[model samples]
Target chain A: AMINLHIQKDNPKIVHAFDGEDLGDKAVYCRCWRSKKFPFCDGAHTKHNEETGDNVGPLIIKKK
Target chain B: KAMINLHIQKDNPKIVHAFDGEDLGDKAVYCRCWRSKKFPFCDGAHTKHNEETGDNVGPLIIK
Candidate 1:
């Protein structure tokens, strides 16, 4: 779901919008539309839907 | 205004699909082609391959 997330940091020691909150060294943006924070997720989708049905296949496994 | 609180994964690996608040509570459309059920927030489909673009009937491509 994240093959398109480009990591363009604006400066060293910090990227754009990254508040340095333990998100890892890699700054990424996903396509998963389950986030309740509009553009990011606080793990809300996991609660809304779990095993995505066959129709909802795995994307990371196929790449773009 | 109709504001939407798009919650996405902090460890997302791609771009977030923008959803239409005018539709669904916005049930809207999730770019599943990119494995993004969350619509704009990618669900981590780039782990397997690297072809960020599809051509489906309604192929969700950075709309």
Candidate 2:
């Protein structure tokens, strides 16, 4: 299942925003689908790495 | 407005099982912790939530 996230709010611990915009430094979003912190990685992807024999990490977002 | 909308695809591309209009009765199990031994279904293993984080995770919406 593809967990799509629409970051429209500011979560200092999760999301970074500026002037009401999600424009900031590179960000990493959860992709392992196991992150307790959805839309933001909390280093839970390691589970998938060992469980499913997959090496996937969080989605890196770059301001472009 | 820092909000996010989620929609769980009935036709999940990641799981091998598909909901083909089966009568689930009242025992419909869904994954909230994302660590279910059975993906997309609740295996009654969430009781072992030892990740040590306070993240809000809920059942995926079926549309």
Candidate 3:
């Protein structure tokens, strides 16, 4: 199943998964400002932006 | 406001530090004997907190 997407970073870190019903052990997403979804990708990477200069930051969700 | 906030997915944690988000690998630990900039993360800020006349408090605010 597709992991519910959200953007915690104001910069890059635009997360996304593949275009199938299967979720592999891991999925790749954009962490750059160019992420068409602003936080997630609607497969925008296939349009204008290349995979270079993508800054994918780590996601840390801890209890406050 | 210095306190301990522990959240564990499972119950009966005797050691306390047992939690899901307790990963402090890059957790900065500074000596309370030198002068530094990084506070609690410990750039040796403890020394100056006394020598240079400073104060330290691990305040935690959950909003």
Candidate 4:
């Protein structure tokens, strides 16, 4: 099932590519652009916030 | 010829993406440092952002 994903307009600057592997039913991707997991957040932006003082988050998407 | 639709949200605070396409036709790169004037496409502004902040960021390349 396809779904809608909402991303912060401020971060994850690059949209990456148009093709990739098979995604799961739901995903919380990293838009903060600091996640080593990439496309997916690993809470790396927490430190990014501490270092840069910028409040940034990730993209949460799921099947509907 | 191809049609690529990039979907994004403007309301809430989050980042997500999806697309429908075969290929981009040629090699391309997108801005990842949020410094691109062209946007979604790279204009090489990351070098300035990197030099000033020492972040060392670059665009994403697809070839």
Task: Give each model's whole-structure lDDT.
Answer: 0.30, 0.41, 0.26, 0.47
lDDT of 4 by residue, B1-63 (tens): 110112222242333343222234355565555456675567887667655654444555444
The sequence of per-residue lDDT tens digits that candidate 4 reaches over residues A1-64 is 1011223334423345532223355555554555767656798767765664444454433444
Per candidate, chain B TM-score? 0.22, 0.42, 0.27, 0.65
Top lDDT hit? 4
Residue-by-residue lDDT tens digits, candidate 3, A1-64: 1111223334221223222223233323222223455433344433322333221221222332
lDDT of 3 by residue, B1-63 (tens): 111112212243211121123333423232222122432223543333333332331111111
Q: Rank the candidates by DockQ, best first.
A: 4, 1, 3, 2
- For TM-score, candidate 2 versus 4, the one ahead is 4
Instruction: Tell me how much of the true interface, by contacts, candidate 3 captures.
Output: 0.04
Question: DockQ numbers for every candidate?
Answer: 0.05, 0.03, 0.04, 0.07
Candidate 2 segments exceeding 4 Å error:
A1-21, B1-63
- lDDT by residue (tens digit), candidate 1, B1-63: 111123334345333333222222312223433334544443444322233332111222222
Candidate 4 - chain A - TM:
0.58
Which ranking of candidates, highest TM-score first?
4, 2, 1, 3
lDDT of 3 at B20: 22
RMSD vs true structure, all candidates: 16.8, 13.9, 18.4, 12.0
TM-score of each: 0.23, 0.33, 0.19, 0.46
> Lowest-scoring 10 consecutive residues by lDDT in candidate 2 chain A?
A11-20
- Cα lDDT of model 1 by residue, A1-64, tens digit: 3222222223211111322232343323333334444344455344433443111112221112
